[PDB]
Design a protein around this ligand. Structure first.
Ligand SMILES: Cc1ccncc1NC(=O)[C@@H]1CCOc2ccc(Cl)cc21
Ligand SMILES: Cc1ccncc1NC(=O)[C@@H]1CCOc2ccc(Cl)cc21
Ligand SMILES: [Cl-]
Lengths: 305, 301
């Protein structure tokens, strides 16, 4: 029993975190094989970040300008290239701790673990979701740039996020490991705002199933709804549309609990129109949307890595 | 900016998780140097769960009865001893991944990270606090026994918890790494109940300071209170008494935000009386009590 926000074990990613210093800027890098990946804004100053021409700034850099440190060992950069908003620093040494890995771009609603680092040293790990507005509600201080988001399937790390910046609302923006930003963001000190956020409907339903598995059933009701009627109500409450794919993904949980997806949807509909009435679900007075259906299955059936 | 429930990176603990099998029971063990630590109930059978005599059951065991597996490598147990409710299986190989570590016994209100494991394999990492009733509100299934709770200071792991049992309410009971149980619990299937839980007041105040540091101030008020008047109100909402030690511990956050501890206490009193009125603090509609003052300072600075 019990349901908690649970991150993937961070050990495989901890063995990849290095410190990257370029002039006065120090941030984190991800050392995989003989390449260190880090945000390209490490080459920028106060003047540069206002309107940076990254190709021009990088052409002025030499390999010895990049100080890369893996623990107390200096790595020697033997090459440098840029792929979108990420800088790839070729090093002479392949990381002996390189795990089996892939670079994956995730969809909004998908969750991942973040290994927050400062000076190439992991300080914390947390589970968060890629918001529908493509921001993440992380916890990052200055120096956390280059910290990565990931998932683990079997013995393989899927790197899905690299932290680049913090928006005025305190939410965070970053890229996949190919340097493509999630959201309509750019890596420049300029006016940028996170769009209005929406609730991740499929994840709320998955968390309601987790609550039923844990014995919380007060919210269940005799009613069911059509997918269309539910989506009408969802649009009204700034909730993401629930697609047929989401219903099929929720299938195993629906079978395990004996509560059809459209039956759980009618519970969610009542929770939105009426509220919790002083009651909580899984110790929360709000509807949690940062547990996907796979996260619920994984935690409720104990899958290991 | 941002505030999240943050667990320590689990890598240093992952390299210590092994599987311990004794007969039909399989749980997790913590391999540090040449010793594997695990709950002593791994030596119990169906008939030996209500009233186990562990000294007698362990005397009947030999080193070869304990099967220890570190990855796909069987470790050879060369000795066994019991320290309170933990079993210490001396092995013929020092763990090369042994980090700098200490065994620490924590107080209620203290937080730690839990590396949940099944069959000596880490499945997830989460954060939680030692409740005032000495239980933990973990996420644990059958086979999770031996999973550990820890904190990390610089490069050193302070092991503070080893999971042992689930109480009827779904809350969890375990011991420090010296086998001493937290709470009035025993490693027996005898009827055991977690006492009524209370909210960790000092942690709620630390989290209100975290909210102020992050720009959330709607809950602040022009009032202050005496420590006694705050405690008379708090107790009515099943909140832990706030001691002078807690007031001293909240000093740095009080200085950083410019809001005196007794001033924040009056804001807490108002929140308890009014509820949140559809508002949230740090994305939560409830008062969070699983962030210590030390956690807030650490995460915010
Ligand atoms: C200070 C901080 C906190 C958390 N995460 C990240 C940061 N850092 C930033 O955001 C920096 C400094 C500010 O200006 C910008 C603008 C664009 C980009 Cl890509 C980076 C940055
Ligand atoms: C099944 C499970 C789930 C989560 N965490 C733990 C468990 N396991 C238990 O509680 C087991 C089996 C049941 O009874 C007792 C009694 C005493 C002790 Cl020390 C252990 C246990
Ligand atoms: Cl599924």
């Amino acid at each position: 029993s019990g349901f908690r926000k649970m991150a993937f074990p961070s050990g495989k990613v901890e063995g990849c975190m290095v410190q990257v210093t370029c002039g006065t800027t120090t941030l984190n890098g991800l050392w995989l094989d003989d390449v260190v990946y880090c945000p390209r804004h490490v080459i920028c100053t106060s003047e540069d970040m206002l309107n940076p021409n990254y190709e021009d700034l990088l052409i002025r850099k030499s390999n010895h300008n990049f100080l890369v440190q893996a623990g107390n060992v200096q790595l020697r950069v033997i090459g440098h290239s840029m792929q979108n908003c990420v800088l790839k620093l070729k090093v002479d040494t392949a990381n002996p701790k390189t795990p089996k890995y892939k670079f994956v771009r995730i969809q909004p609603g998908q969750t991942f673990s973040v290994l927050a680092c400062y000076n190439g040293s992991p300080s914390g790990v947390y589970q968060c979701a890629m918001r529908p507005n493509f921001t993440i509600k992380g916890s990052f201080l200055n120096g956390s740039c280059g910290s990565v988001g990931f998932n683990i399937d079997y013995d393989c790390v899927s790197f899905c996020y690299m932290h680049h910046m913090e928006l005025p609302t305190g939410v965070h923006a970053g890229t996949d490991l190919e340097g493509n930003f999630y959201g309509p963001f750019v890596d420049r000190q300029t006016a940028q705002a996170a769009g209005t956020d929406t609730t991740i409907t499929v994840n709320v339903l998955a968390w309601l199933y987790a609550a039923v598995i844990n014995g919380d059933r007060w919210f269940l009701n005799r009613f069911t709804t059509t997918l269309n009627d539910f989506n009408l109500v969802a649009m009204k409450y700034n909730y993401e549309p629930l697609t047929q794919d989401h219903v099929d993904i929720l299938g195993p949980l629906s079978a395990q609990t004996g509560i059809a997806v459209l039956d759980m949807c009618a519970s969610l509909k009542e929770l939105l129109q009426n509220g919790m009435n002083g009651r909580t679900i899984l110790g929360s007075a709000l509807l949690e949307d940062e547990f996907t259906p796979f996260d619920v299955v994984r935690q409720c059936s104990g899958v290991t890595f």
